[PDB]
Design a protein around this nucleic acid. Structure first.
Ligand SMILES: [Cl-]
Ligand SMILES: [Mg+2]
Lengths: 267, 276
DNA sequence: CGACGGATCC
DNA sequence: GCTGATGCGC
DNA sequence: GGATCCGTCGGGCGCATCAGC
């Protein structure tokens, strides 16, 4: 039932040391997450890049503590005009854009060797009320990512709001008709991997590892039972797999109903 | 007439010793400047804080020697987004600043790489590469609008902390601030609009021109010389680069230097000594 | 943008 | 990869 | 007529892009 992420491999298959550390966190209430000492974990993880999803915080209400990360001094925010995302970078991105070209869910940062996308994929909702909107969003998102990656290697991170396979969640049989494990959402994630193309960094390295989740409902004490879902991903262009050192699930960092995830790249 | 910067005054008027040395340099292309040995001057100057303008270089392309600067290990870089190769500012600090921010309000959408704000314990340092009004003044109005947005931005800094504004403000404030005031009144850097904009910056914020406060009547003191026509050798130049201080800081002012002899750009470095 | 040439000032 | 032309802005 | 004013003009630099190879 319960899961322990393996230690960080900071060396590429070919032996190159990790030069790039990306953390992504659905903080599910940036302000609450700040109060729950979220920045303490950021300061400790010291990523080169931090992606936040479901911030639920207008730009003009962003806490002042965020200005106290000179190590992530380039901060970009996208507000929803129940979402919101942030991208914080140590180095100055070459260019930063918002949305999928077409609700505050996607930021795109261009760097030297790759393009970073963070995404807060829309939840299909209780009773699947927004499943269809999710299905359209998935296709539009797939389309959008295809063009990006047809110009530069791609890292896609964030809350993709789908458990790809049964191994990616605790109770597949009871969730095959809930948001995040519908055949439609699962198909969309499979299409996303196939069509872009992209590799599930974590699953590429831990193909056989069960019980590794990134989200647990606040309710029923799901997190302490590790009754959860892997909803947060680092997806990678195949051309970046040689640089892949590790893809972590930070199961024990608190402050949200998601835990953070961490990517290591030898770039 | 040639100019010789007076010796470094390292003690305040009241006798208090300088504790903070800030250099500012428009390096006119950071990769060029390093290959013309600009970093040798930085190591000789050994400033606590180095602000650079016109880095013309995105962060991925910073030369490795810039990591070989152990006394300036906290490095903050900003390059424009559509116009890489132009602008670009850098702030390098011995100590780590409490807060760093970029731009003057909406850099996450502007992404101009002209302005770096760094808050330290006792003050707020802004370095700016102020947009040039252009040949034929074609971007003067944008420069007037920028000036006003910058004024209001500097005004609305939510710190009681005194302010240090440094860098290439891209205007000779008064006639004493360039060699040819009359023939340049319609040239970028010396229009009434930019001069008034400078004057309103000092009055609005409010700020004092550190060098001019110490050397109110000293002429021929410039920080920029066009590469063309051996202007520098003739010391036909402009004072474009400044240290501007909140009034609270003046008694802490020991000296504002023009490092006329340092080569490697068409600007020379300026240096502030503060007794903090 | 400083050099240059040409006009204007007394 | 490298040079040097061109373009653009300073 | 020396000084001064004023408008025009050629051009040094750095870096991106592009063509060529
Ligand atoms: Cl930076
Ligand atoms: Mg310049």
């Amino acid at each position: 039932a319960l899961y322990e992420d393996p230690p960080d491999q900071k060396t590429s298959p070919s032996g190159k040391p990790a030069t790039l550390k990306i953390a992504s966190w659905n903080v599910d209430g940036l302000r609450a997450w700040i109060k729950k000492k979220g920045l303490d974990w950021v300061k400790e993880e010291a990523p080169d890049i931090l992606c936040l999803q479901e911030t639920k915080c207008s730009e003009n209400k962003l806490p002042a503590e965020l200005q106290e990360l000179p190590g992530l001094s380039h901060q970009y925010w996208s507000a929803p005009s129940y979402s919101g995302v942030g991208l914080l970078s140590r180095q100055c991105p070459l260019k930063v854009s918002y949305g999928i070209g077409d609700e505050g869910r996607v930021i795109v940062a261009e760097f030297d060797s790759f393009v970073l996308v963070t995404a807060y994929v829309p939840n299909a909702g209780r009773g699947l009320v927004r499943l269809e909107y999710r299905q359209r969003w998935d296709e539009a998102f797939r389309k959008f990512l295809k063009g990006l990656a047809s110009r530069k290697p791609l890292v896609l991170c964030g809350d993709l709001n789908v458990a790809h396979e049964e191994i990616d969640l605790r109770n597949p049989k009871g969730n095959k008709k809930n948001a995040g494990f519908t055949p439609q959402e699962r198909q969309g994630f499979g299409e996303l991997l196939q069509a872009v193309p992209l590799a599930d960094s974590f699953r590429h390295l831990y193909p056989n590892t069960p019980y590794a989740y990134t989200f647990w409902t606040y309710m029923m004490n799901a997190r302490s039972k590790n009754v959860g879902w892997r909803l947060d991903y680092f997806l990678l262009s195949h051309s970046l797999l040689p640089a892949l050192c590790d893809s972590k699930i930070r199961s024990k960092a608190l402050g949200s109903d998601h835990c953070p995830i961490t990517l290591y790249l030898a770039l």
